[PDB]
Design an enzyme around this catalytic site. Structure first.
Site, PDB file in Angstrom:
ATOM      1  N   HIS A 226      -0.708  69.031  23.973  1.00 59.17           N
ATOM      2  CA  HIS A 226       0.122  69.519  25.065  1.00 59.17           C
ATOM      3  C   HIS A 226       1.510  68.882  25.081  1.00 59.17           C
ATOM      4  O   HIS A 226       2.279  69.113  26.018  1.00 59.17           O
ATOM      5  CB  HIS A 226      -0.598  69.374  26.421  1.00 59.17           C
ATOM      6  CG  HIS A 226      -0.746  67.967  26.918  1.00 59.17           C
ATOM      7  ND1 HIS A 226       0.321  67.103  27.065  1.00 59.17           N
ATOM      8  CD2 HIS A 226      -1.836  67.290  27.351  1.00 59.17           C
ATOM      9  CE1 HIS A 226      -0.109  65.949  27.542  1.00 59.17           C
ATOM     10  NE2 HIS A 226      -1.414  66.037  27.725  1.00 59.17           N
TER      11      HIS A 226
ATOM     12  N   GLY B 150       3.411  60.034  31.153  1.00 56.08           N
ATOM     13  CA  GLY B 150       3.791  59.492  29.868  1.00 56.08           C
ATOM     14  C   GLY B 150       2.734  58.626  29.204  1.00 56.08           C
ATOM     15  O   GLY B 150       2.927  58.226  28.049  1.00 56.08           O
TER      16      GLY B 150
ATOM     17  N   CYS C  97      -0.291  59.686  28.418  1.00 53.43           N
ATOM     18  CA  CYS C  97      -1.059  60.539  27.520  1.00 53.43           C
ATOM     19  C   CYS C  97      -0.812  60.143  26.067  1.00 53.43           C
ATOM     20  O   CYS C  97       0.303  59.792  25.684  1.00 53.43           O
ATOM     21  CB  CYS C  97      -0.729  62.018  27.746  1.00 53.43           C
ATOM     22  SG  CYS C  97      -0.758  62.558  29.475  1.00 53.43           S
TER      23      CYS C  97
HETATM   24 AU    AU Z   1       1.333  63.028  30.185  1.00 52.51          AU
END
Ligand code: AU
Ligand code: AU
Ligand code: AU
Ligand code: AU
Lengths: 301, 301
Positions: B41, B143, B145
């Site tokens: 993503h 951020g 992820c």
């Molecule tokens: Au994220």
């Protein structure tokens, strides 16, 4: 979201951990530049620990009796001296992994990360706080002595603790990197009691702020209070007295949440007088006091 | 002595963390050999996340749109492919810090260490467990992820988790390193509920054993019980059903303490039926279920 007890990344410190052996004992040392730091009781036999005269014991030790091994390579000891309760072993090779670093003596209530090691190899990492009685509630087994506590700010490792002792009550004592013990403890196997273990009030307030930021708000009441009046309750429950300095350090958290510091104190008051009635705050059923206000801001930003 | 929630040393994984940017989004990637792994993503806009068609979104992406930066140096992307919910970015330089590593899909109840990162830089490390509902109660902000979970056995890093999502309830979801989500979750901003969050019974028993080893023994009663009969109580309190496999895995701890597994279960029974009456076990006022039996043995040896 979420709030966890978070240690600093351990990599920069892993590269500094070595094994130090003086006759039978093996413990951990810290290799920074061309000096290895270790607890001075490495020179002791388990017999010596009852009442050692470290100066006399050191007289019969020469450079070559201290075997220092980084990983699987030996380091060559070219000098040794005792500074307070640590030995400084001068080696002929600067550690190529030396980070930017400082030695700092921390105050009670401040937190740091410990990298638990055995025979110079890291085993795990966790977050602790220097208790007001100058002990730490660590996880240490035989051979963990010489493991260090540290903070990481940007690229600089601030070394603040070296592990030395387990007291008979199962808590831990140690020195700064200059070898001075925190609190009244000595590197001797004797009767050494810890004082009263008061709770770090300012940290509890910081953690309550972290809770509000992360969804838990049931404990917010409609009350307020005064410093003096709250401190009467704090004293009764063996909490550190809260000062104006503490209020000021909580200011940023006070601004972020819109909850005045004294309103949060009144909520804490109620928690201390009434308990939590089986509920929880950030997954805990007691009041956590090993997060500093700095810890909360860093983890919440 | 002492028992702490202990993460693995983070150094080997720090050296693998990079920053990955696809148009606006920046998240973390894992650089192992000459491949960078990241959440797919990254190719999405916050607008896309409501219901993205990742295959179509990827069509308009070429190697040079993925900017991968280790520290302050750019890596050159020479290939890209989507595998389930991760992207594999082939770069022209093998990571010189690649540790020995494996990809493992863990089972619910098993624990691991997470190295929380932002823009490819590590921020902190903590220990978690894969909940029976396949969520984790993490600490993640925007951020984070691409941060990964791992176990370290000897010199091998076993990667088991990559962080993807925060569900509306504040818990976290993610994939193995092959990109398959744990549980029923999808990389879409939608209504995705977690199931019932049952407690990991076997871990609670392991932690009670750790308590006995480390001094806390008030909860040991004079009772015993049977598997079936204990499981009736477990079911009522939303505990995982205990199996003979669980009993066997607790055998070493059963041997070390001299407390039969079924005697420890009867003590747990009493704790569940009667609460802890304001006392604590290993500094907690609730029953901890994020220590595996392996975790206990490793930390206690
Ligand atoms: Au994220
Ligand atoms: Au510095
Ligand atoms: Au020791
Ligand atoms: Au391997």
């Amino acid at each position: 979201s979420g709030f966890r007890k978070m240690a600093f990344p351990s990599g920069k410190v892993e590269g500094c951990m070595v094994q130090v052996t003086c006759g039978t004992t093996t413990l951990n040392g810290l290799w920074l530049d061309d000096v290895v730091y270790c607890p001075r009781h490495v020179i002791c036999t388990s017999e010596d620990m009852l009442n050692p005269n470290y100066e006399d014991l050191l007289i019969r030790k020469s450079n070559h009796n201290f075997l220092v091994q980084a990983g699987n390579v030996q380091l060559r000891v070219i000098g040794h001296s005792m500074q307070n309760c640590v030995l400084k072993l001068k080696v002929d090779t600067a550690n190529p992994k030396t980070p930017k670093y400082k030695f700092v003596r921390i105050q009670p209530g401040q937190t740091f990360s410990v990298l638990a090691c055995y025979n110079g190899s890291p085993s795990g990492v966790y977050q602790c706080a220097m208790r007001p009685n100058f002990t730490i509630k660590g996880s240490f087994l035989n051979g963990s002595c010489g493991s260090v506590g540290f903070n990481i700010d940007y690229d600089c490792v601030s070394f603040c603790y070296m592990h030395h002792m387990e007291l008979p009550t199962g808590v831990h004592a140690g020195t700064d990197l200059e070898g001075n013990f925190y609190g009244p403890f000595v590197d001797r196997q004797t009767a050494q009691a810890a004082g009263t273990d008061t709770t770090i009030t300012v940290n509890v307030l910081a953690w309550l702020y972290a809770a509000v930021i992360n969804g838990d708000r049931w404990f917010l009441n409609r009350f307020t209070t005064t410093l003096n009046d709250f401190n009467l309750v704090a004293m009764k429950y063996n909490y550190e007295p809260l000062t104006q300095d503490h209020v000021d350090i909580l200011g940023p958290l006070s601004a972020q949440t819109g909850i005045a510091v004294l309103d949060m104190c009144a909520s804490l008051k109620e928690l201390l007088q009434n308990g939590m009635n089986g509920r929880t705050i950030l997954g805990s059923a007691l009041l956590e006091d090993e997060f500093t206000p700095f810890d909360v801001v860093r983890q919440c930003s």
